[PDB]
Symmetry: D2
Subunit: 370 residues, 4 copies
Amino acid sequence: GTFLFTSESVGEGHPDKICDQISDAVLDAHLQQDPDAKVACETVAKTGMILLAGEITSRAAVDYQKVVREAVKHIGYDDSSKGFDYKTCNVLVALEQQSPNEEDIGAGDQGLMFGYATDETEECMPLTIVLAHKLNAKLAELRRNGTLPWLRPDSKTQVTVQYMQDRGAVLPIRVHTIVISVQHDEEVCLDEMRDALKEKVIKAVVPAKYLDEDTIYHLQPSGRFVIGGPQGDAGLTGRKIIVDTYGGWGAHGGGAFSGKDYTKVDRSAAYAARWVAKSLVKGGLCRRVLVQVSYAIGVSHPLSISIFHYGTSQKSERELLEIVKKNFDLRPGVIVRDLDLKKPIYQRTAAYGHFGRDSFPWEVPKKLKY
Amino acid sequence: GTFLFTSESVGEGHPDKICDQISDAVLDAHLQQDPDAKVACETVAKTGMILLAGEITSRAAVDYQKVVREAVKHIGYDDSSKGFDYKTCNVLVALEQQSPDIAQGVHAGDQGLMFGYATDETEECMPLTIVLAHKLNAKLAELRRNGTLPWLRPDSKTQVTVQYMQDRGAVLPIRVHTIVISVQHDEEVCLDEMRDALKEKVIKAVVPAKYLDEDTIYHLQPSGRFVIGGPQGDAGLTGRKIIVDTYGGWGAHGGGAFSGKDYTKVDRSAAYAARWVAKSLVKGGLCRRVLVQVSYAIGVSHPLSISIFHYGTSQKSERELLEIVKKNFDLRPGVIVRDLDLKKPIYQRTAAYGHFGRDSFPWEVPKKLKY
Amino acid sequence: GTFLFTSESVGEGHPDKICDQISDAVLDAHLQQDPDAKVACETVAKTGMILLAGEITSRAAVDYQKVVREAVKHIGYDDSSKGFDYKTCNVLVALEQQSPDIAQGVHAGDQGLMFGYATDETEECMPLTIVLAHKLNAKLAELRRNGTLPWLRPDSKTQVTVQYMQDRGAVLPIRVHTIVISVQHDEEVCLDEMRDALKEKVIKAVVPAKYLDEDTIYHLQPSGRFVIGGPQGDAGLTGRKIIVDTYGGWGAHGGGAFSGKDYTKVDRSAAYAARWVAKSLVKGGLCRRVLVQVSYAIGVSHPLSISIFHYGTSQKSERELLEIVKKNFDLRPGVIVRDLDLKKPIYQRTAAYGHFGRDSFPWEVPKKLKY
Amino acid sequence: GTFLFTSESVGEGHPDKICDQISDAVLDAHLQQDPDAKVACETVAKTGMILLAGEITSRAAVDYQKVVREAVKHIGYDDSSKGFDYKTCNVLVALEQQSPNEEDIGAGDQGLMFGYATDETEECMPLTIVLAHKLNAKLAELRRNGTLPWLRPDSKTQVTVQYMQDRGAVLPIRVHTIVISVQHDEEVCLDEMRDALKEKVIKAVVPAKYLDEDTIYHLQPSGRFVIGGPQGDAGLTGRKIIVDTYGGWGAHGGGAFSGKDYTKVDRSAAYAARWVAKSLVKGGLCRRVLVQVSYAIGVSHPLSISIFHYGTSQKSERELLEIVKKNFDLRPGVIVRDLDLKKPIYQRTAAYGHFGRDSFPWEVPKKLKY
């Protein structure tokens, strides 16, 4: 049977994503000096304020004012006309910082985590969330290179796709609806914005085979959007966890990723579960798969591993599990080495999705032996 | 045929849940005085600080000192020895409140989806993994408050792994495979005594005996020592336990936290409606297990689309169930608000022990279906 | 015989004065609704932040978003280019407000001293050094607001050194020795043009020509460049300009700031009373220059002691002046409050340009004395 | 003619003095690593919170959480029963920190400053403020060594003395009134507290010749005082400037001292003016004297220097000025060298008065040539 599915993505200037990106900029600053830094950094953004709160164990000396302001400048908030300015906003810091066989390190917390993959795209991700992210990334590219200099940092996209099912797999047929709202400078009209959104953004990102006569476009649906970001709005780290992962597809364990080092299995085991799911699909063992893992605080080994193939394998779920246990060691002290999780690359994961890119180690499938 | 599935839950004193409870206490304070209040309240808790941020349109005048402090008191943080004290903590108010529109005084949102889920494996009509996880935290609070284990403090986390088998799409719990409990405690009690009380007075008082066996794995105080807890040990924020609030990893989640958001946030009121629909189908005997997917389109009050996925557990087709749902439910967000009585101040009770599964809310009372 | 004496003053946009003005705006908001409000409001201003802290007992419901933002708007900080903007700054409210006593609803402090001072060297009855310093800041604000020098920003500081001679204890200003002016400015204007306008349109519009000569020293924009100012460049707090608020180093100060404190704080209302007494003696022709010292004892409403020090500028003994003061003034703090109308919301006007010397307040209106 | 004079002092646990002491602990932490650090650190204390705000130019890496908490522990707040606890209070940091002939350095700000001295005590200070400070210091000594273990950190004293005048000098005759309020543990009665205040504090500090039959004692005048410090109270740096100096005597320029390095003439020139006043009095050039100096931002030399002797010299005020100008160079870049103002000794100045101690360089008179 057929169904519609909708995923959302948000640009770097959305207040929740500002916080994710600042959190990871703080993490990256620690890791550049101290690869073994432990970081749990939560960020809050509201009118005129960034606040940092959390715990850090690190030998680094980090200038938080500079790291935060620079990230805000990088996002593109440099003037009160845009709603926020890195030069004059309030930065408050409440980070409590202590000084300090690695394969046996215990999980930093308990929790459950999922990975997912699907053969419907080359990236091995759901089409809805690939397209939603790609529309926001293209907005930011065109903003930053001056192709559309009226663009500002805050944006939200929603993409509805009509699917068919094929023996537990999902086959995207057409884009049903695209919604784009993007922040903009006072000096452009809506007719021009709408035309640019359709021609320079949607047509540059969405394969033409999914767009047809009945595709519904809602471009700047709420009209003008001059002020954005944290102004009259409050955001927090870890409030876009569905957007950061599979856009509604598969499942989620509840843990946020941004501002967390590798011992926080919320992030490292979700990355490893994605790596497992992608490896199974690119291995041709199934067409779509969900992987669950779980941990207890202070315990190095997973408490559970489970594999659900949606009926898209010739192997049983039990046989896939046995294969997974022969090819992967999901201790955090081992995941760190296989996925290089002490490298300061996290600020790049904080927008446009943690999954479906090529450059990240969890997106390179492992050759399986079975 | 068998598989494992794990869910977690956290106690009232976990720092993220403190924040959910405070944000909903704020919402209830506003609704008490102004049933049309619009609220989007975020809370941050860290060593000695409660910060309230967000936007409110309301006629209410709320005393945040009182609302925040009583909530913290009720949770049980009343001394520096416990890491946090309602008498001495810093309450910072950064909320932006405006009066409702002058001219309306004198006279349906995002393109998005919501999921509801229900399963006949428990009477709560919820996954056993998460029902048990919630009940373990609730039992710790009960024994802490009636003084049976006076060494307990408010911060707790639990995790339950169940071994299941499948039967024509339904899931049948066989036994509890693994239980984790970590709970904050006073300085005097010993690990042995804690691990013994958690097994004998908590777990065995909550988990049906038929699910426990000699191979069940217990990880009780697995870190070894948990004196530092609450916001002292970890920063809390509103809306960071969204899976604990819902189905424990089962079903699906389309995104959005609930607490500190009024009934006009559709990702809060339509999620409750989709639960209501899923629970009504299962209690109506129409299927054993169901995922209800409700899509809304920018503007249109009527849902864009509804899909019902019964996993094979129904004698009727997915198109027949969809027809039943349409004949019995009106899922326009304004109709939902009236049918589920969502203008009333009951939200603080939702903010610990899960939004779904308790027999305390209108969305947990099934609708008798005609067909 | 001659000597130098220096005093300073600061503009409305100096970060410490922003805080004094906000704290008094808070007090006035409360008094407007509840004339018995008790207020002790502290303000901190730093890059992008206004923080309100302190204690209030009041029946008022005040909108701090509005009160703080309008005050900042009025000061002139309305864009990030100026370093601070009322539209986008973070207002954090940490004030602790309680209702007045339940049971009194249905039905004189520290051992300390206060000083008043007055001198006949100006009509304001204040030292010339500080009268001139205040007027230079006021003139900058006037020319900034009417657009004569649109390159001016709100943050300014001035300092005036006067050469004096003495005559039987009175002080006689001879000339202005040195003037300092530092004022925040836009990016485009050049130092030469600023230094020329400050001399020609500010100083020469304010200082009587008889005090200026070819040897007068001008330090105008002495740091060279002052684009970064307001709370961006320096943290402000309430009650850090207490000498600018009073006599500019002349007379004496027994300790205490004024702004954000209601009339029941005796170090605020008895300082105004002692000014009133000192000014009344000088305008009554009883002396040319006077320091009035009023001591209060823990509990006793009546002053413990009053000493009058006339520096030799009076035909009457210091004991005769004391007798006159006692026959004409009742310095019990409750009587002071009634006589000077201190329950009214006029405090925000006190918080820039000095509490003493302007003909705008009851304590600056002399009492006609009988003797 | 005779008159009464009253001075106040407050203990380390008074909320305003907590902030002064934290500000100077932050300054001292910078100076221990970077002698040329520029610091303007303001502290705010209220229920459950210390906030730091200001500007720093320094090469130091300072852990602010540790510096603040430790200072709070040092003051003696370790439990919510006392109203405040270093282990669980909120510490928020908003310090903006940049990296960077010294005799020519310009004043860090404009301002006026006074120094004062008087021959009425050996310390060359007014008796009222010497006694007020000494009562608070003795309370803290007895608290910290366990002589009176019921004592807590917050305290306030007021001392009224009856004076005579002698040719512009002031002669203290008797103590008229002593007020002491001190914070205390629940477990002591007021009768015992009052007796200890009189016998172990007042009699150990006030010379017996000033105490007589009519001396009024107000000991714990407002009754019980269990909770103190910042709880239901707000304090700020630089709100006790009269207490920190001459207790009402002489004059004040308005600048606070705590949290400021030597380029902030509010502090360095006030120290130097005190040094000048003390040198004149110990030199026998007068019995009592007030010194004024003033500065402009970015200008190294004083704009004005003035000397008022109260009629207590045989020399004219003009002759004293000429002597001062021959023996002292009041440029901040020179004052720093003469008074050793890069040394991290400032936390010790933050309670019990900056003046009248023996160990500080501004309290050692210079031998004058004239």
